[PDB]
Design a binder for this molecule. Sequence first.
Ligand SMILES: CC(C)(COP(=O)(O)OP(=O)(O)OC[C@H]1O[C@@H](n2cnc3c(N)ncnc32)[C@H](O)[C@@H]1OP(=O)(O)O)[C@@H](O)C(=O)NCCC(=O)NCCS
Ligand SMILES: C[N+](C)(C)C[C@H](O)CC(=O)O
Length: 599
Amino acid sequence: SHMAHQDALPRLPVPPLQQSLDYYLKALQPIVSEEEWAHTKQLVDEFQTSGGVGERLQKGLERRAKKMENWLSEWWLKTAYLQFRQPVVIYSSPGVILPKQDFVDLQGQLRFAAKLIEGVLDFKSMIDNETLPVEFLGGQPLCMNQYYQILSSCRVPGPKQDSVVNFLKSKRPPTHITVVHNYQFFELDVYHSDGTPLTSDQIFVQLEKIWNSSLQSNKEPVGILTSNHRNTWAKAYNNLIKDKVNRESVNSIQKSIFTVCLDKQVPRVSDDVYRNHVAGQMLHGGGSKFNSGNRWFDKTLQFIVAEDGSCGMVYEHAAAEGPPIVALVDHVMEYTKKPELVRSPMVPLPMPKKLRFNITPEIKNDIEKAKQNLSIMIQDLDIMMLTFHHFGKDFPKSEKLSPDAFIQVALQLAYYRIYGQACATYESASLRMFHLGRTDTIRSASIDSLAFVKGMGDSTVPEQQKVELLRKAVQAHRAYTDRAIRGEAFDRHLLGLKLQAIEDLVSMPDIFMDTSYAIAMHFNLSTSQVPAKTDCVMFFGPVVPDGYGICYNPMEAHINFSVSAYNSCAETNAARMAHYLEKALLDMRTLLQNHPRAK
Ligand SMILES: CC(C)(COP(=O)(O)OP(=O)(O)OC[C@H]1O[C@@H](n2cnc3c(N)ncnc32)[C@H](O)[C@@H]1OP(=O)(O)O)[C@@H](O)C(=O)NCCC(=O)NCCS
Ligand SMILES: C[N+](C)(C)C[C@H](O)CC(=O)O
């Protein structure tokens, strides 16, 4: 972003070694046995002793911090995404469901699409001019680098690891977006020769041409290839671009500012599962027979406009986290609600270029394989969308409690009620108060949360007592949160010590091969919060086979929830987890209301 802004932001620190180990042991207590904790406790002591292994690694991390803008940046990007070989679909690229629009016909669909496109270009103007407003979190300025990674970017399949291309600041920045309809991609210029952006009416005109240029799905769904395994896609991709035309098509897609997907009509399903299917449409596309082929999952920003008024998006996670994405969403949506000014006449426009694809037997085979793979992934995904209307941030605040911590503690209660034990829980924490900061880990399963969940279901404990336990659990979580955003958490630190050990060419420390660490990093509950003014919600698949993927948008009077799980694991059920979460949130409200503090 603006160099001046970034230069004033503090650099990502390296927490004290003994401090992070202390927090690590405390976070382990509720998720490991006494025997395992006692064992880990010894490993830690040895690990941190004077002249020991841990001390040498810590020294290394500190040297890394003095010779890089961010000691964690590249390591995280690589281990978290670039070296993650599983398909980006469902497993990595988050999905977003925006408020359903009111258009009732094709003209309306394109009308909103044209407006949305223009709204993105308006937001993009603040990026190209570095005039984008500064953001705060803990009362500190926030890194804006992510905003310069989302547009005109695209992920690239790699045989060993993937890469990312960014053309935003290239010699001649892209002035075109890509539009996908019935599996056919089109190169659409959204800027005039003089350098001014096209109008909503103009973009609309072009969308019509594009639409009439792909009235049937008689073209192979090449884009579906991008949903396969990264290793497989890498090879299929390397073959695909061997044709001049093909490479030219891919290149355009990769350089486009962003992609707009004009999805087709889907089988009218029951209302009790509608929202869930829409979530799937945005996350993976529904399937090869639906809209999955009308995508390109390597593209950083993909906006989706359904035929039934439904809309949303899916973005490639390597570029950024949710906050930056939603800020863009809020702006665009708020822009689509701008009263159309005086309609001015527009001269003829050029015919959007069609990004053709030369299909061969080999490519054909790759596509079919991609279909099979994607079909398996979809059939194994269990999603449950829950709109908590009972209340939002309003109640927790009236109780002088952090809404997020209230929600997280509720999740801990729900889980414990189902399984009778706590589990490694992950909650995304933003590290943007630091230059190039991405995220750190907040562990919702703690000593205090466990004391609460247990006492909560103990029919021998006074309600007055459960209240104290609840508030203490919430406060403990808020304290952990404050430390996380300030770079005082330990997960990224411990990861850094591990990677540092590898780089130093020393044997892998036992502390990292310890059972407790394996358990601590196996997140049965992987969660995050993505605030927004728009009544939208995000979702992603679980990070472990036997876990859940839970995301939410805490609003004032309600909370948009999303719960994912894998059908391959009989011990997990999205609907059930969501139901227990809803009930846990209510029981906590009931408990607090039954015992007011004020006199
Ligand atoms: C963890 C995190 C979400 C916490 O955010 P937060 O804003 O502190 O959440 P809280 O629930 O504490 O605060 C929400 C609201 O309740 C208020 N509040 C908090 N504690 C309160 C209390 N004890 N009493 C009254 N009000 C309180 C806050 O002021 C805020 O007010 P607002 O509604 O006017 O904005 C944030 O620090 C973070 O890391 N966000 C990034 C997560 C991310 O990266 N997500 C995407 C991953 S891909
Ligand atoms: C979905 N989840 C929590 C696994 C990944 C987050 O979106 C990103 C992060 O916390 O680094």
